[PDB]
């Protein structure tokens, strides 16, 4: 109620920072221009559902309009058998409704950044009709493998061990009928909490990019297609790099309630490039258009070109993971976090994150050259609840 926000941009970001701060906020004018479908979006309201589920003690209200909301954050606790669930290793269920277009990663990255600041573990289980696992065309949402091997090594850099970072898919899925649809189930066991993560100094140049790995997924189509994608992408990249290596994976189909029906048909491919210096990684993805049927070779060329563009453009961290690592460096201890960013890599989204953090009241960012070295001053809050034994 006390702090206020406007518009619909960076909704998840504003929300998760309000959780991380315990600052009671109130946002207005989500979809004021849209007289067609004003107010919330369904992925947002399921997002609010999930937030209320995972947290405890939080209060959220949405207008009769649905276009203005107000939120009193409680605590990040996690899979607790007293309140939330039945057991310790009990997994908290989450359905998201069928009319979802947006990404699983669009659910994950806020959840991913918040959850190391819980009292106990996290055991989310995403099922539902609208569980896409692939990348969207959409807001160009990430895919599962991209998300995993692209941002979780960064938590490994931040001090949170991938040894107890756990994400597994059981079913994968594409969009299907339009952007809506889904069907692939996933479950994540964040088993590593820390008091305060390591404040980090990525300042050395990530010069020699050593290799490229990646993953072609096909959900309902023959594996010849993703094979062809490997051929296409290696035809792009072998003029640069010998060690390019792409696993392939085929899933038959997801089946969804209406009686059941097959959905989530499609395919796409993820590219990650790995720098010899330290955990510096450049990723991109491309997904087939959910009703299109374009040539997988063209998709391979496209994803290849996207990877090459982030190679050219990115200083060390790519723009997709930029908000994450910045927020974690912000929630690092009361010290300087020193990241080496590139000039093209700055986004209006990153600037919005800067603005909203400044609205929250934690300290600021100093910007000097080297590409631009940014430095943040950590507010050193960390998790609030933890059974320190």
């Amino acid at each position: 109620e006390f702090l206020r926000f406007t518009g619909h941009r960076a909704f998840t970001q504003r929300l998760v920072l309000a959780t991380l701060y315990g600052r009671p906020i109130h946002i207005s004018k989500i979809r004021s221009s849209s007289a067609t479908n004003p107010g919330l979006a369904p992925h947002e309201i399921s997002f609010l559902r999930l937030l209320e589920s995972v947290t405890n003690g939080s209060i959220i209200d949405v207008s009769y309009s649905g276009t203005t909301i107000t939120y009193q954050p409680g605590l990040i606790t996690g899979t607790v058998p007293g309140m939330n669930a039945s057991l310790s290793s009990d997994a908290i269920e989450h359905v998201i409704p069928a009319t979802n277009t947006r990404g699983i990663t669009y659910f994950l990255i806020p959840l991913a950044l918040l959850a190391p600041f819980s009292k106990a573990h996290l055991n989310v289980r995403f099922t539902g009709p609208g569980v896409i696992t692939s990348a969207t065309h959409g807001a160009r949402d990430l895919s599962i493998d991209t998300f995993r091997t692209a941002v979780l090594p960064l938590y490994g850099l931040f001090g949170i061990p991938p040894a107890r970072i756990e994400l597994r898919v059981l079913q994968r899925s594409c969009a299907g009928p339009g952007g809506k649809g889904g069907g692939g189930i996933v479950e994540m066991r964040f088993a590593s909490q820390v008091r305060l993560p390591k404040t980090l100094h990525l300042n050395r140049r990530p010069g020699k990019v050593r290799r490229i790995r990646g993953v072609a997924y096909c959900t309902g189509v023959a594996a010849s297609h993703n094979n062809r994608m490997i051929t296409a992408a290696r035809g792009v990249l072998n003029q640069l790099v010998s060690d390019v290596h792409i696993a392939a994976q085929y899933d038959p189909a997801p089946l969804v309630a209406e009686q059941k029906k097959k959905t989530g048909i499609g395919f796409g491919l993820s590219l990650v490039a790995e720098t010899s210096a330290e955990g510096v990684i450049y990723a991109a993805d491309e997904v087939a258009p959910p009703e299109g049927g374009v040539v997988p070779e063209d998709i391979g060329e496209k994803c290849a070109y996207q990877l090459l563009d982030v190679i050219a453009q990115g200083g060390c961290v790519m723009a997709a993971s930029a908000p994450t690592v910045l927020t974690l460096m912000a929630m690092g201890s009361e010290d300087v976090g020193r990241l080496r960013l590139g000039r093209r890599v700055v986004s209006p989204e990153l600037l919005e994150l800067a603005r909203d953090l400044k609205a929250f009241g934690a300290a600021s960012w100093g910007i000097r050259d080297a590409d631009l070295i940014v430095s943040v001053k950590g507010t050193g809050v960390g998790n609030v609840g933890r059974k320190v034994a």
Binding site: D145, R148, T149, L152, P153, L154, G156, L157, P161, P162, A163, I165, E166, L167, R168, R213, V215, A216, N227, I230, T231, R234, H245, I246, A247, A248, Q249, E278, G279
Partner: peptide, 24 residues
């Protein structure tokens, strides 16, 4: 096609565990 990587690269990549940064 030469995309077939390795059992080890498979185990580090497509498994539930994300690959750590601090290894070679």
């Amino acid at each position: 096609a030469d995309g077939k990587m390795s059992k080890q690269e498979l185990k580090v990549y497509l498994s539930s565990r994300p690959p750590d940064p601090t290894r070679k």
